[PDB]
Design a protein around this nucleic acid. Structure first.
Lengths: 35, 217, 150, 144, 129, 131
RNA sequence: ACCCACUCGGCACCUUACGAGAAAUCAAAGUCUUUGGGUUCUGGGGGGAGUAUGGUCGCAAGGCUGAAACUUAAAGGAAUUG
RNA sequence: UCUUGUAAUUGGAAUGAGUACAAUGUAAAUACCUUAACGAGGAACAAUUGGAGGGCAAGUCUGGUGCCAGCAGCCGCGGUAAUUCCAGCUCCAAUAGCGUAUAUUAAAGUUGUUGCAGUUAAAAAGCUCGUAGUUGAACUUUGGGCCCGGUU
């Protein structure tokens, strides 16, 4: 539920008036692979 | 195409007043925004916050937009503008209007000896708004402003050069810190020093002597 | 406020701004002294001599007319008592309330007031033996206090 | 006011009151009771070494799962048994039984990090070589 | 009780200046209160003060004039070494120029600038600015 | 048991490492002077902070103090002899007003470029390194 | 006995913010980032836990003093809106 | 008409990493300093370590694998509590260094002397007496005049 959590908290800074990077197909993935 | 609508508007329309120190000297109440635009140019603006707030009714959910903006030209004159309106352009516009209505002058000074074009604040000063205390401490030459980027932007728009900025409380709320900084810089203008101990002439409020072309039509 | 209660009352006496000879007195400077000695030989305490002088003979206060305080005058002629006046009255009060307690053993308020009165007696006796008015130890106890008071 | 004694000759009460209150810390009580040298899985050590006792098929969920497994290991110096999250997938074929792995913490100064409940160690090394080099096909695991 | 009469005097002055009164009554009076107010009056922070003399301990009536931000006591009277005097200022003054912290030395009761000029030190007493 | 050889590091990394204004100013300086990394900027900032701390606690000292006079005159003489501080600014509030690129101007690389002979800053660095 | 005026010491009450506070609200919860009148007691995220053990008081019931191992990213309060 | 960039375009310059006559060096050697001769055209003499919703600087990238009683029908689309299941591209930071673990310090006013808090968020002994300890009203030579000489 990482993608759902990031999308849910992703909308709050729009309500609170802060800039948010626009979403695409890189959100809920391991950006940097582990060891 | 602004027309004079009040006594101060008729005062500034003929150009018989040339400084804002007369307004800030005898505690002149400011009524409109056009006086400071027609009297001082170069008032640069920068939006600080735009947020969607809500009001819940019986049937609908009316969403307002709240605009928080700052105003200051380049030197010692800071205004804060808070507004809730219906559209983003209207909220920004009315926030700039109330920002011009809330302009306060600032007395800067020297951290050390009295040489070379004052840079910093004269006194240790504080301000508070809702469990956020913003403190301002004079700093030496070349120290710069060490503060949060919102407070740093506000103080750079102020025209002050070196400020040490300690803060306390839950500082993550942007509005509380901004209002604390605003009341702090108002406090450091309002502070009384021995340099203000010389006997001023105490003028006779020249609105009395200029009332015969500043009255009603 | 008070030392052993919750009160905060301020009722007292206000000595006037004068230290010399009220104009209506014009009587003497040693007749008042011999009245003090006569009253003390009758069997009175310094405060009672003071109240009798101020209510009967027009002596505003003996500190200004005689030049000395009443207990100093009684010390000069050898009329000083064994134990001082306020300690004597505290001891007499303690003896009376202790007799009332031993007659009525279930009175807890009288027990509490005994504890308060003995605490006051101990603090006063410590003050008196600090400046060496009492004998240097004097060891106040409950029973012999009866034989100490009368 | 302000509760505390303030007189000039009153340093002793300040000292003793501060010592008792400092005994109501969390770090001070953990340090002066010697808690890590007697009770911690490590001996107050930064890393440790252990013998792989078991590996369990711990997935995040059921068959549509995330392959994030952990092994159960027994220490060399203490003898206590702990569990450790191995690195990224593909390293499970490297870690067999009885491999003499070297372990570190997980990142919360002595507490579990991540969505794995109750795992605070990671297998830094296996058989005395690495996991980063062994996963990147740079060095290979020595036999026995 | 009145452990410090100077503290009560400074509190009375501070509250009366905050409220906006012209006169403030101070009771009881003392040598150190008179000297503290004399340092204030010499520096011009307060106006003119006059000592009502009843036989007990006196009262003081202070004519204020505004121009006083805060006066305060420091309790207990810490011993102040001379090389640490400036440190004290940095803890209780807005700037380094205006405002004075007041010391009692064996050369008298004086502000910190006079203590630095005379090369003396002593016990901290309070501050005014 | 040989007597120890004292060493000391001559740079200090910034407390907040990811902020855009400082990063772009550092890249501005590195581009205009031709620097290998950020450690030169850190080194200049470190020694300038040392100079500024010395100037500050001399200016806190009372005037006509012999230590203040001696150390202040030595500091001003040294920073004029280096060539960073100008000839007409021999005061202490003026040495508090120094900046990083004022120090970075007086390098041999920048001075060999500005005196002709190099036609670039990177050509100046390459020309210096090659003896 | 009552009425009017003043004063001392009480139990309280209505409004307000020069002030304070997260807010409800407070003549104290004020005189505090402009931080110091004097002095006792207490707290330091939540569970484990008022638990184990020791000491001590009590005829008993129980009282007083009182942990750690482990575990968790919450827990809590004040108001608005339905 | 003077200033920058791009490129399967092109030209000559320069130097040390190294290979080393020699000489310095050294108790004797190794190395540093100096130097006869050789030593650069890119897969040469090729820099790595971390990371990219926000923290925090940097993606409205690409491909493959696995599931769906969801549409289509063998082309495929969409979803996938696959906490991305696996790789690549692009970008950012530091740079001969960079990452991780543990401890400690700062941010920390979460130890508070400076400098915390205790109605309701943790926390005022049920109440009073009371020993040590901590603290404790005001007052005792102030004022005036004389000279001389020190520092700006």
């Amino acid at each position: 539920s990482a993608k759902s959590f990031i999308l849910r908290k992703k909308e709050l800074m729009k309500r609170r008036g802060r800039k948010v990077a626009k979403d695409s197909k890189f959100t809920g993935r391991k950006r940097r692979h582990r060891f | 195409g602004w027309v004079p609508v009040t006594k101060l508007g008729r005062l500034v329309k003929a150009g018989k007043i040339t400084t804002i120190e007369e307004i800030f000297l005898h505690s002149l109440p400011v009524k409109e925004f056009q006086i400071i635009d027609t009297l001082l140019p170069g008032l640069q603006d920068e939006v600080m916050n735009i947020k969607p707030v809500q009001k819940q009714t019986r049937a609908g959910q009316r969403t307002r937009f709240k605009a928080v903006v700052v105003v200051g030209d380049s030197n010692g004159h800071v205004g804060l503008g808070i507004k809730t309106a219906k559209e983003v352009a209207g909220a920004i516009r009315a926030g700039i209007i109330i920002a011009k209505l809330s302009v306060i002058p600032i007395r800067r000074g020297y951290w050390g000896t009295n040489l070379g074009q004052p840079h910093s604040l004269a006194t240790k000063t504080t301000g508070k708004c809702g469990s956020v205390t913003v403190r301002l401490i004079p700093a030496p030459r070349g120290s710069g402003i060490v503060a949060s980027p919102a407070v740093k932007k506000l103080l750079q728009l102020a025209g002050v050069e070196d400020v040490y900025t300690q803060s306390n409380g839950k500082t993550r709320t942007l509005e509380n810190t901004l209002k604390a900084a605003f009341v702090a810089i108002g406090n450091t203008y309002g502070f009384l020093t021995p340099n203000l101990w010389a006997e001023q002439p105490l003028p006779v409020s020249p609105l009395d002597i200029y009332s015969d072309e500043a009255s009603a039509q | 406020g008070r030392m052993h209660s919750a009160g905060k009352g301020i009722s007292s006496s206000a000595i006037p701004y004068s230290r010399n000879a009220p104009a209506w007195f014009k009587l003497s400077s040693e007749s008042v002294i011999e009245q003090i000695v006569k009253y003390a030989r009758k069997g009175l305490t310094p405060s009672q001599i003071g109240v009798l002088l101020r209510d009967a003979h027009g002596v505003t206060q003996a500190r200004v007319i005689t030049g000395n305080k009443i207990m100093r005058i009684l010390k000069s002629n050898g009329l000083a008592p064994e134990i001082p006046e306020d300690l004597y009255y505290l001891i007499k009060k303690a003896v009376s309330v202790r007799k009332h307690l031993e007659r009525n053993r279930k009175d807890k308020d009288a027990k509490f007031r005994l504890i308060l009165i003995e605490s006051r007696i101990h603090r006063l006796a410590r003050y008196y033996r600090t400046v060496a008015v009492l004998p240097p130890n004097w060891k106040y106890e409950s029973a012999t206090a009866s034989a100490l008071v009368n | 006011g302000k509760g505390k004694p303030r007189g000039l000759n009153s340093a002793r009460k300040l000292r003793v009151h501060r010592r008792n209150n400092r005994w109501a810390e969390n770090n001070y009580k953990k340090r002066l009771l010697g808690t890590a040298f007697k009770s911690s899985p490590f001996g107050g050590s930064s890393h440790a070494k252990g013998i792989v006792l078991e590996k369990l098929g711990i997935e995040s969920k059921q068959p549509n799962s995330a392959i994030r497994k952990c092994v159960r290991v027994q220490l060399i110096k203490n003898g206590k048994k702990v569990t450790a999250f191995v690195p990224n997938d593909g390293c499970l074929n490297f870690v067999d039984e009885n491999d003499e792995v070297l372990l570190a913490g997980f990142g919360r100064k002595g507490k579990a990090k991540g969505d794995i409940p109750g795992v605070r160690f990671k297998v830094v090394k296996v058989s005395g070589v690495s996991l980063l080099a062994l996963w990147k096909e740079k060095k290979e695991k020595p036999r026995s | 009780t009145r452990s410090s009469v100077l503290a009560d005097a400074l509190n009375a002055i501070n509250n009366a200046e905050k409220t906006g009164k012209r006169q403030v009554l101070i009771r009881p009076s003392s040598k150190v209160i008179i000297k503290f107010l004399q340092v204030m009056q010499k520096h011009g922070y307060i106006g003119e003060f006059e000592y009502i003399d009843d036989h007990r301990s006196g009262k003081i009536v202070v004519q204020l004039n505004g121009r006083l931000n805060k006066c305060g006591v420091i309790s207990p009277r810490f011993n102040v070494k001379i090389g640490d005097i400036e440190k004290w200022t940095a803890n209780l003054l807005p700037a380094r120029q205006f405002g004075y912290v007041i010391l009692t030395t064996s050369a008298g009761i004086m502000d910190h600038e006079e203590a630095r000029r005379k090369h003396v030190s002593g016990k901290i007493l309070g501050f005014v600015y | 048991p040989r007597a120890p050889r004292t060493y000391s590091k001559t740079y200090s990394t910034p407390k907040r490492p990811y902020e855009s204004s400082r990063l772009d100013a550092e890249l501005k300086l590195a581009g205009e002077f031709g620097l290998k990394n950020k450690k030169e900027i850190y080194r200049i900032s470190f020694q300038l902070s040392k100079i500024r701390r010395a100037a500050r606690d001399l200016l806190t000292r009372d005037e006509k103090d012999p230590k203040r006079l001696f150390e202040g005159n030595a500091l001003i003489r040294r920073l004029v002899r280096v060539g960073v501080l100008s000839e007409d600014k021999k005061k202490l509030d003026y040495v508090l007003a120094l900046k990083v690129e004022d120090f970075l101007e007086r390098r041999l690389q920048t001075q060999v470029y500005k005196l002709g002979l190099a036609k670039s800053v990177h050509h100046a660095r390459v020309l210096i390194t090659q003896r």
